[PDB]
Design an enzyme around this catalytic site. Structure first.
Site, PDB file in Angstrom:
ATOM      1  N   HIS A  17       0.870  -1.181   0.000  1.00 11.35           N
ATOM      2  CA  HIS A  17       0.000   0.000   0.000  1.00 11.35           C
ATOM      3  C   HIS A  17       0.903   1.225   0.000  1.00 11.35           C
ATOM      4  O   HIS A  17       2.130   1.106  -0.087  1.00 11.35           O
ATOM      5  CB  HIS A  17      -1.108   0.000   1.061  1.00 11.35           C
ATOM      6  CG  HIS A  17      -0.647   0.168   2.471  1.00 11.35           C
ATOM      7  ND1 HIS A  17      -0.214  -0.885   3.245  1.00 11.35           N
ATOM      8  CD2 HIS A  17      -0.593   1.269   3.263  1.00 11.35           C
ATOM      9  CE1 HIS A  17       0.098  -0.438   4.452  1.00 11.35           C
ATOM     10  NE2 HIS A  17      -0.103   0.866   4.473  1.00 11.35           N
TER      11      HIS A  17
ATOM     12  N   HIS B  93       1.590   3.835   2.084  1.00  6.44           N
ATOM     13  CA  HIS B  93       2.197   4.528   3.196  1.00  6.44           C
ATOM     14  C   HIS B  93       3.717   4.336   3.228  1.00  6.44           C
ATOM     15  O   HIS B  93       4.270   3.413   2.619  1.00  6.44           O
ATOM     16  CB  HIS B  93       1.583   4.051   4.514  1.00  6.44           C
ATOM     17  CG  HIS B  93       0.165   4.519   4.720  1.00  6.44           C
ATOM     18  ND1 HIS B  93      -0.740   3.830   5.470  1.00  6.44           N
ATOM     19  CD2 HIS B  93      -0.483   5.635   4.317  1.00  6.44           C
ATOM     20  CE1 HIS B  93      -1.896   4.443   5.481  1.00  6.44           C
ATOM     21  NE2 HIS B  93      -1.758   5.573   4.824  1.00  6.44           N
TER      22      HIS B  93
ATOM     23  N   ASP C 187       5.787   3.172   5.370  1.00  6.87           N
ATOM     24  CA  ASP C 187       6.329   1.905   5.822  1.00  6.87           C
ATOM     25  C   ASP C 187       6.310   0.836   4.710  1.00  6.87           C
ATOM     26  O   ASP C 187       6.879  -0.235   4.917  1.00  6.87           O
ATOM     27  CB  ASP C 187       5.646   1.387   7.100  1.00  6.87           C
ATOM     28  CG  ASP C 187       4.138   1.236   6.975  1.00  6.87           C
ATOM     29  OD1 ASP C 187       3.475   2.078   6.350  1.00  6.87           O
ATOM     30  OD2 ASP C 187       3.600   0.288   7.592  1.00  6.87           O
TER      31      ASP C 187
ATOM     32  N   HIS D 218      -7.154  -1.577   6.077  1.00  2.00           N
ATOM     33  CA  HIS D 218      -6.249  -0.571   6.610  1.00  2.00           C
ATOM     34  C   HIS D 218      -6.158   0.620   5.665  1.00  2.00           C
ATOM     35  O   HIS D 218      -5.999   1.771   6.090  1.00  2.00           O
ATOM     36  CB  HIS D 218      -4.876  -1.219   6.850  1.00  2.00           C
ATOM     37  CG  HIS D 218      -3.818  -0.219   7.059  1.00  2.00           C
ATOM     38  ND1 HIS D 218      -3.642   0.421   8.263  1.00  2.00           N
ATOM     39  CD2 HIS D 218      -2.883   0.260   6.216  1.00  2.00           C
ATOM     40  CE1 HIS D 218      -2.666   1.290   8.142  1.00  2.00           C
ATOM     41  NE2 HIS D 218      -2.201   1.213   6.909  1.00  2.00           N
TER      42      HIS D 218
ATOM     43  N   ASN E 166      -2.793   2.473  12.943  1.00  2.00           N
ATOM     44  CA  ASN E 166      -2.982   3.792  12.353  1.00  2.00           C
ATOM     45  C   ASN E 166      -4.124   3.723  11.348  1.00  2.00           C
ATOM     46  O   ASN E 166      -3.974   3.136  10.265  1.00  2.00           O
ATOM     47  CB  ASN E 166      -1.702   4.300  11.720  1.00  2.00           C
ATOM     48  CG  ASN E 166      -1.787   5.776  11.414  1.00  2.00           C
ATOM     49  OD1 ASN E 166      -2.887   6.312  11.211  1.00  2.00           O
ATOM     50  ND2 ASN E 166      -0.641   6.449  11.396  1.00  2.00           N
TER      51      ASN E 166
END
Ligand SMILES: Cc1nc([C@@H](C)c2cccc3c(-c4ccc(CS(C)(=O)=O)c(F)c4)c(C(=O)O)[nH]c23)no1
Ligand SMILES: [Zn+2]
Ligand SMILES: [Zn+2]
Length: 232
Positions: free
Chosen positions: A85, A87, A89, A150, A181
């Site tokens: 995804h 983000h 990280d 998420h 998150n």
């Protein structure tokens, strides 16, 4: 010395690998965000005499350290990477990978969200993943889009040779007490997307969350439970 490495055992900037199965490792790194320190996982899958990387190590310096740790512990070149995804990280470090000869991939949805957010952008688009339940093969893994969880773009990864399910950030570890998150999450759709994972990969033997300790299939039901409670 053998147990899965935890957030307090990895200084920010170092990377550790953990053997999951024959030809399958996770990578673990730590990063600071908004004044707190978090661990995060990715995956490495042997692909003949090459390696497939799933997710960066959460930043440029951590991802450089990841490549050095792979060279030390495994000694095969990373030739492709997939980000699950948008983000940081998952994509932070894509520029380091691209300068080290690694071809970087993500879904078109992840690429558009990373660009809009100001994150690093994988080079190549993965088609065939735009509807929930879609699956495609990519080297030694299957990529699966379960639906929004998420994030709207989150992908999970299955390694059929070892029955390893890498859930990424759509799956939480058993000790988790909230849904992580949730800035970009769909809490209402997340349990449905987890149910799709459970139905598609009933023979999974190891389940790896995007942050924290691997376990078995129970991580999927635990994730549904914490997400429903967070929403409540
Ligand atoms: C904007 C925006 N930036 C991000 C990323 C980069 C990010 C930063 C800091 C922390 C996280 C976490 C996170 C937080 C808490 C826990 C423990 S828990 C399940 O008990 O609550 C956990 F396991 C994970 C996640 C994720 O949930 O994937 N992502 C993060 N996301 O959005
Ligand atoms: Zn995320
Ligand atoms: Zn995450």
């Amino acid at each position: 010395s053998g147990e899965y490495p935890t957030v307090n055992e990895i200084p920010v900037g170092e990377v550790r690998l953990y053997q999951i199965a024959d030809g399958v490792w996770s990578h673990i790194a730590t990063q600071s965000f908004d004044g707190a320190v978090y661990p995060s996982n990715g995956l490495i899958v042997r692909d003949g005499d090459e390696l497939l990387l799933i997710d960066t190590a959460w930043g440029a310096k951590n991802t450089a350290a990841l490549l050095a740790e792979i060279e030390k512990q495994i000694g095969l070149p990373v030739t492709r990477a997939v980000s699950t995804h948008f983000h940081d990280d998952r994509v932070g470090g894509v520029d380091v990978l691209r300068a080290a000869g690694v071809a970087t991939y993500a879904s078109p949805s992840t690429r558009r969200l990373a660009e809009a957010e100001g994150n690093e952008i994988p080079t190549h688009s993965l088609e065939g993943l735009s509807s929930s339940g879609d699956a495609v093969r990519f080297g030694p893994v299957e990529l699966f889009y379960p639906g929004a969880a998420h994030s709207t773009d989150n992908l999970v990864v299955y390694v059929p040779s070892a029955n390893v399910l890498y859930g990424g950030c759509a799956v939480h570890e058993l000790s988790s007490t909230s849904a992580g998150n949730v800035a970009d999450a769909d809490l209402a759709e997340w349990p449905t997307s987890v149910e799709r994972i459970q139905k598609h990969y009933p023979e999974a033997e190891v389940v790896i969350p995007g942050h924290g300790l691997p376990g078995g299939l129970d991580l999927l039901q635990h994730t549904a439970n914490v997400v429903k409670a967070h929403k409540n």
